[PDB]
Every structure is written in structure tokens, then in C-alpha cells.
């Protein structure tokens, strides 16, 4: 599918789709796992795999892409959904440098 | 100045400018007062005066425009600044209908 962009719209439609039809919720996090997810989406939906970044730790890793509603919570981490993320751009609040 | 749009960028630059050089902070709210502010900005900076809407009450009136960081708190209200507004689109969280 046409190489498209990761807009806030996309980030939710997709963020949503992963909850209502999938076991990402809870699933322990690993770089390799993220990559197959990232590579998959990129092929399935078409978004270039470089948007799924989280804040640097320690603690909770808030997504850098507003709209994407999944943070990584406890360094063993899990894919924890959270919809106040679809409205609160936490990661920008904490790390304004990144934006 | 060229009739421009009220983008999140503008909404803060402007939202900021009002704190660091003005007594809007606290000032009791009235429709008429808002209007002279709205009409002024529109002339000064150039933004068509129809962006400064807040949520319907009771209670706190969160701005409908993300970026604009001023809510109306207590029905006598005041122009109360708040920067977690530049990151949290509260009004969309509460009233998803409006968006």
C-alpha cells in the first residue's frame, strides 16, 4: 500500500485496532518484538517503521507520537494501553527537548 | 495582516504572549470583554475571531482550540492560564462530540 504518513488520525485508528483485536495489551516488551510489530504494520497498513519511539527511562515510557496510545510500564516492560494518551501529549510535557 | 489560520503553533505563541505582557490572568470574564480581545487579536495578529470557544458549563470552561492555554474558572468566571493545556487537550477528552 502507498507509503503513507503517521498522522494523529492514523495513530489512533491503529492504536485502537490493536486493542479490540489483539493481545498486545500486557505482552512483555523487547526491541525485537516491537520490530516485528513495526515491520508488520508498515507492510499491512503502510507506515514507515520509525514512529514507534518511547521516551527514555527510567520508569514509564510515554510514546513520542501523539495519537499512539500505548506506553511501556514496568528493566522489564509491558505494552500497556491508556487512552488519556490520545488527548494528553505526555511525552512532550516531560521531554520538550524531543519536540 | 494576511488573514491567517489558528494553528496549534499560533495558539501558544499568542497564549504565551498574553501572560508575559498582560493582565488577562485573573480578569473577570464577560462576553463583551472576550470580544474586544478576540476583535483586537484578529486585527493585531490577523486571526479570524471565532476560535476562542470554551466548553459549555457548569464548572470549568476548557478551550476548544488545543494550544490555547487559558480556561475559565469560577456564573462568574476568570481568565485563568494553565500550561498543562498546551499538552492536554482536555476539552476533547470531556466533550468528544464537539470534535
From Swiss-Prot, chains A, B:
Region (Mediates dimerization, Nef-PTE1 interaction): 35-51
Natural source organism: Human immunodeficiency virus type 1 group M subtype B (isolate BRU/LAI) (HIV-1)
Name the record gives this protein: C-terminal core protein
The organism's taxonomic lineage, starting at the top: Viruses, Riboviria, Pararnavirae, Artverviricota, Revtraviricetes
Signal peptide: none
Region Mediates dimerization, Nef-PTE1 interaction, Nef-induced CD4 and MHC-I down-regulation and enhancement of infectivity, annotated ranges: 35-51
